[PDB]
Amino acid sequence: ASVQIKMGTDKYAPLYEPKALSISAGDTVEFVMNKVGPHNVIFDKVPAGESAPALSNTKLAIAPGSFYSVTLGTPGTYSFYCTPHRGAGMVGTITVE
Amino acid sequence: YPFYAQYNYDSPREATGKIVCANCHLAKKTVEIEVPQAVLPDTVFKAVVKVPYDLDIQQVQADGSPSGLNVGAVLMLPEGFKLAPPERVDEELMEEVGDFYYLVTPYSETDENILLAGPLPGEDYQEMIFPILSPNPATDAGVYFGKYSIHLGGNRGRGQVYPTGELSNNNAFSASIAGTIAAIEDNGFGFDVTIQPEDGDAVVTSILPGPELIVAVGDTVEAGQLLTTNPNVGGFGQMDSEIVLQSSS
Ligand code: HEC
Numbered sequence: 178a179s180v181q182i183k184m185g186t187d188k189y190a191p192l193y194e195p196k197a198l199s200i201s202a203g204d205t206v207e208f209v210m211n212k213v214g215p216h217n218v219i220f221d222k223v224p225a226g227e228s229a230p231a232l233s234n235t236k237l238a239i240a241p242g243s244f245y246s247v248t249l250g251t252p253g254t255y256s257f258y259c260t261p262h263r264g265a266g267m268v269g270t271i272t273v274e
Numbered sequence: 275y276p277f278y279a280q281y282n283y284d285s286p287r288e289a290t291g292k293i294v295c296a297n298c299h300l301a302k303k304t305v306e307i308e309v310p311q312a313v314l315p316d317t318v319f320k321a322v323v324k325v326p327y328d329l330d331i332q333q334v335q336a337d338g339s340p341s342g343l344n345v346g347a348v349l350m351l352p353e354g355f356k357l358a359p360p361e362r363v364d365e366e367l368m369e370e371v372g373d374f375y376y377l378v379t380p381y382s383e384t385d386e387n388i389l390l391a392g393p394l395p396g397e398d399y400q401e402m403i404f405p406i407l408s409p410n411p412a413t414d415a416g417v418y419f420g421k422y423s424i425h426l427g428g429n430r431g432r433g434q435v436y437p438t439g440e441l442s443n444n445n446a447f448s449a450s451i452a453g454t455i456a457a458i459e460d461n462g463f464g465f466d467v468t469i470q471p472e473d474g475d476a477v478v479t480s481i482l483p484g485p486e487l488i489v490a491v492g493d494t495v496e497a498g499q500l501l502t503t504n505p506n507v508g509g510f511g512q513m514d515s516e517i518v519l520q521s522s523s
Pocket residue numbers: 260261262275276277278279282286294295296297298299333336342343344345346347348392393394427428429430431432433434435436437438442
């Protein structure tokens with residue numbers, strides 16, 4: 178089902194929430210900015226099927242509200258991270274079963 | 275980011291007076307702050323902050339591509355001073371000041387006198403105006419009337435180091451060892467500059483996309499010598515000002 182990726186916790190902690198995310202081939206994964214911005218989508222790498230090193234948008238959306246959404250299909254576990262909040266420990270995952 | 279300062283340092287201002295942002299943001303650039311000469315006790319006044327840079331010049335971004343710069347700052351007010359509540363801001367002033375609530379965040383719960391802003395788009399905010407509410411010494415024992423100092427730390431552009439301690443792409447990279455450069459490979463990233471040391475060994479130094487390679491293959495380099503230029507366009511600067519907490523009448 179349609180899911181969303183929140184960047185930042187109510188604990189002023191810059192982390193991807195939910196830390197883990199699962200979906201099916203054909204589902205969508207939204208992305209909204211919680212706090213401790215800015216943020217952005219900087220995937221780590223995905224298995225054959227998709228293009229992790231492509232979807233990565235360096236369009237640091239300063240304006241808080243809701244970055245954008247994107248649909249997937251390629252089955253497997255996708256990994257990403259926050260370009261800025263890289264050391265802060267802001268990484269997550271996305272499954273497309 | 276200001277967030278990073280909060281995690282790393284309880285106190286943003288070192289004894290020396292150096293502001294913590296400096297640890298990450300290596301280059302120095304100007305910071306300006308203007309406030310009134312004096313202010314009456316529980317009154318609201320504006321603190322104007324500016325962080326200059328040439329808008330024409332682009333910075334290396336996380337992906338390695340060029341883009342605009344973002345700005346941010348830490349404004350350290352005297353004890354008892356805080357960002358003014360919306361209710362407190364007088365009518366003429368409200369439009370003049372930054373969205374009082376949204377832009378400003380306290381350093382910590384105890385730290386309300388230390389205000390953080392940003393990151394914000396540099397192009398958008400030529401001036402950041404903080405609505406500030408002075409304390410009232412009659413009510414508050416902790417503060418007295420007198421002259422006080424305000425410390426500003428203002429930054430533009432991406433920092434050199436991460437809280438990880440590892441260097442960012444917006445920094446100079448140096449030869450890990452002396453030798454000759456056999457070859458260099460490139461996805462923007464120089465996955466590697468391969469250097470042949472003095473006695474047969476070959477080492478590889480990886481540089482991320484963004485910095486520009488100074489050296490060419492077949493070139494000799496000393497250890498620690500710069501492999502790349504310094505791509506850093508921005509910088510962090512500090513400036514102090516004084517304000518007089520005045521007695522009415
Ligand atoms: C632990 C190191 C560290 C500290 C401390 C730190 N920053 Fe940063 N800051 C960085 C790095 C690195 C970046 C770049 C992140 C990225 O885009 O990959 C950054 C980015 C920023 C940006 C966005 C700039 C742009 O053009 O995208 C602003 C604004 C900023 N910091 C302001 C500050 C201020 C003000 C302080 C001090 C109150 C501060 N930072 C403290 C490391 C730090």
